[PDB]
Structures are given as C-alpha cells and as structure tokens.
PDB file of C-alpha atoms (C1' of nucleotides) in Angstrom:
ATOM      1  CA  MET G   1      -0.928 -11.645   5.854  1.00 24.87           C
ATOM      2  CA  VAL G   2      -2.575 -14.378   4.438  1.00 24.62           C
ATOM      3  CA  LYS G   3      -6.404 -13.676   4.175  1.00 21.45           C
ATOM      4  CA  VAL G   4      -8.383 -17.014   3.901  1.00 18.20           C
ATOM      5  CA  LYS G   5     -11.775 -16.580   2.470  1.00 18.50           C
ATOM      6  CA  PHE G   6     -15.012 -18.738   3.485  1.00 15.78           C
ATOM      7  CA  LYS G   7     -18.709 -18.703   4.050  1.00 14.07           C
ATOM      8  CA  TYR G   8     -20.779 -19.145   7.814  1.00 15.52           C
ATOM      9  CA  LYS G   9     -23.972 -18.473   7.697  1.00 14.86           C
ATOM     10  CA  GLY G  10     -24.040 -17.325   4.171  1.00 16.16           C
ATOM     11  CA  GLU G  11     -21.966 -14.704   4.364  1.00 17.48           C
ATOM     12  CA  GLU G  12     -18.427 -15.260   2.381  1.00 18.68           C
ATOM     13  CA  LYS G  13     -15.774 -13.708   4.773  1.00 21.11           C
ATOM     14  CA  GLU G  14     -12.604 -14.130   5.580  1.00 22.62           C
ATOM     15  CA  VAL G  15     -10.050 -14.109   8.569  1.00 21.60           C
ATOM     16  CA  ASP G  16      -6.321 -13.172   8.382  1.00 19.52           C
ATOM     17  CA  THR G  17      -4.042 -16.103   9.318  1.00 21.00           C
ATOM     18  CA  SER G  18      -2.159 -14.300  12.275  1.00 23.09           C
ATOM     19  CA  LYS G  19      -6.538 -14.760  13.702  1.00 21.95           C
ATOM     20  CA  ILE G  20      -6.429 -18.108  13.551  1.00 23.24           C
ATOM     21  CA  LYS G  21      -6.393 -19.562  16.925  1.00 20.50           C
ATOM     22  CA  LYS G  22      -7.071 -23.844  16.223  1.00 19.66           C
ATOM     23  CA  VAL G  23      -6.256 -25.748  13.180  1.00 19.83           C
ATOM     24  CA  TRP G  24      -7.993 -29.289  11.908  1.00 19.97           C
ATOM     25  CA  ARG G  25      -8.794 -32.121   9.466  1.00 21.47           C
ATOM     26  CA  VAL G  26     -11.783 -33.146   9.031  1.00 21.43           C
ATOM     27  CA  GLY G  27     -11.597 -35.297   5.683  1.00 21.17           C
ATOM     28  CA  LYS G  28     -10.730 -33.241   3.293  1.00 18.06           C
ATOM     29  CA  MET G  29     -12.498 -30.209   4.856  1.00 17.20           C
ATOM     30  CA  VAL G  30      -9.799 -27.959   6.715  1.00 16.20           C
ATOM     31  CA  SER G  31     -11.435 -25.860  10.263  1.00 17.26           C
ATOM     32  CA  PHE G  32     -10.519 -23.679  12.438  1.00 17.24           C
ATOM     33  CA  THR G  33     -11.078 -21.225  15.445  1.00 16.70           C
ATOM     34  CA  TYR G  34     -10.401 -17.920  14.966  1.00 18.53           C
ATOM     35  CA  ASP G  35     -10.033 -14.679  17.172  1.00 16.38           C
ATOM     36  CA  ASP G  36     -13.273 -12.678  15.925  1.00 18.25           C
ATOM     37  CA  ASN G  37     -12.677  -9.109  17.440  1.00 17.35           C
ATOM     38  CA  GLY G  38     -12.389 -10.603  21.147  1.00 17.57           C
ATOM     39  CA  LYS G  39     -14.750 -13.932  20.305  1.00 19.41           C
ATOM     40  CA  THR G  40     -13.858 -17.190  18.744  1.00 22.39           C
ATOM     41  CA  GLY G  41     -15.530 -17.272  15.386  1.00 18.74           C
ATOM     42  CA  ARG G  42     -15.505 -20.556  13.436  1.00 18.09           C
ATOM     43  CA  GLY G  43     -14.876 -21.438   9.451  1.00 19.62           C
ATOM     44  CA  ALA G  44     -13.705 -24.198   7.146  1.00 19.56           C
ATOM     45  CA  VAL G  45     -12.399 -24.583   3.806  1.00 20.28           C
ATOM     46  CA  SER G  46     -12.150 -27.378   1.205  1.00 20.36           C
ATOM     47  CA  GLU G  47      -8.084 -27.841   1.431  1.00 20.70           C
ATOM     48  CA  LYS G  48      -8.085 -27.447  -2.173  1.00 18.19           C
ATOM     49  CA  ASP G  49      -9.503 -23.877  -2.044  1.00 18.16           C
ATOM     50  CA  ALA G  50      -6.864 -24.047   1.919  1.00 20.64           C
ATOM     51  CA  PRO G  51      -3.595 -20.852   1.255  1.00 20.85           C
ATOM     52  CA  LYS G  52      -0.325 -22.444   1.667  1.00 20.24           C
ATOM     53  CA  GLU G  53      -0.029 -20.468   4.577  1.00 19.82           C
ATOM     54  CA  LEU G  54      -3.243 -21.929   6.441  1.00 17.98           C
ATOM     55  CA  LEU G  55      -1.760 -25.926   5.221  1.00 18.46           C
ATOM     56  CA  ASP G  56       1.256 -25.105   7.333  1.00 16.37           C
ATOM     57  CA  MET G  57      -0.409 -24.060  10.605  1.00 15.58           C
ATOM     58  CA  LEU G  58      -2.555 -27.564   9.848  1.00 14.57           C
ATOM     59  CA  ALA G  59       1.161 -29.112   9.380  1.00 15.00           C
ATOM     60  CA  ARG G  60       1.775 -27.946  11.981  1.00 16.31           C
ATOM     61  CA  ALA G  61      -1.351 -28.978  14.116  1.00 13.73           C
ATOM     62  CA  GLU G  62      -0.547 -32.256  13.319  1.00 12.98           C
ATOM     63  CA  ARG G  63       3.446 -32.864  14.356  1.00 14.16           C
ATOM     64  CA  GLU G  64       2.544 -31.031  17.380  1.00 11.86           C
ATOM     65  CA  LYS G  65       2.644 -33.090  21.143  1.00  8.97           C
ATOM     66  CA  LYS G  66       0.583 -31.110  23.263  1.00 12.25           C
TER      67      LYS G  66
ATOM     68  C1'  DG U   1     -20.869 -38.658  10.698  1.00 10.10           C
ATOM     69  C1'  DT U   2     -16.954 -36.834  10.719  1.00  8.30           C
ATOM     70  C1'  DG U   3     -13.222 -33.130  14.055  1.00 10.53           C
ATOM     71  C1'  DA U   4     -14.150 -28.969  17.026  1.00  9.70           C
ATOM     72  C1'  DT U   5     -16.563 -25.553  18.749  1.00 11.53           C
ATOM     73  C1'  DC U   6     -20.315 -21.495  20.028  1.00 14.29           C
ATOM     74  C1'  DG U   7     -24.411 -21.254  20.720  1.00 15.74           C
ATOM     75  C1'  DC U   8     -28.578 -22.393  23.301  1.00 15.19           C
TER      76       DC U   8
ATOM     77  C1'  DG N   1     -26.915 -32.146  26.604  1.00 15.30           C
ATOM     78  C1'  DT N   2     -26.437 -30.914  21.738  1.00 12.66           C
ATOM     79  C1'  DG N   3     -27.971 -28.906  17.139  1.00 12.97           C
ATOM     80  C1'  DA N   4     -25.881 -26.644  13.502  1.00  8.64           C
ATOM     81  C1'  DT N   5     -21.468 -25.986  11.498  1.00  8.32           C
ATOM     82  C1'  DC N   6     -18.523 -26.596   7.949  1.00  9.14           C
ATOM     83  C1'  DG N   7     -17.091 -30.282   3.185  1.00  9.33           C
ATOM     84  C1'  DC N   8     -17.275 -33.668   1.840  1.00  9.95           C
TER      85       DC N   8
END
DNA sequence: GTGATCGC
DNA sequence: GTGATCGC
C-alpha cells in the first residue's frame, strides 16, 4: 500500500501502512507501532513528512471510542 | 516533557 | 521500574 520511510536507531527503514497497528500524535510528531515480521516495532515521522494515508489512520484513531 | 511502547 | 526512542 503506502510505505512510510522513517529512521529508528539510525536505521532509515520503512513499513507498509497495512502493518501499522497503532497511531497517535505527540505535537507535530506522528508515532506508531507496527507488526515487524511477527514482532512490534515502533516508529515516528514529522506530521509534514507523513503520507495522507498515515494521517487518515490517525484521524480514525482520534475519532474512535474504545 | 510529550504518548506509547519496547527492551531490559 | 523505567530509559531510550521518535520530532518538536
């Protein structure tokens, strides 16, 4: 789908938006957890460098009642 | 610090 | 129990 390129521990990796489990904002930072080959990894990008698909995911989280 | 979590 | 981690 949409791939998010992000740096974690120097590593300039990426993840498919379909692997992202959880999304949340901390200011202008968009943070998330994703299913890493059967594991949970973490990641974060600036809201500016976020593809619209990641901001839609966040939009869904923010309007959620759970 | 912050939200949220992993890794220890 | 909580340090690093991510962008600011």
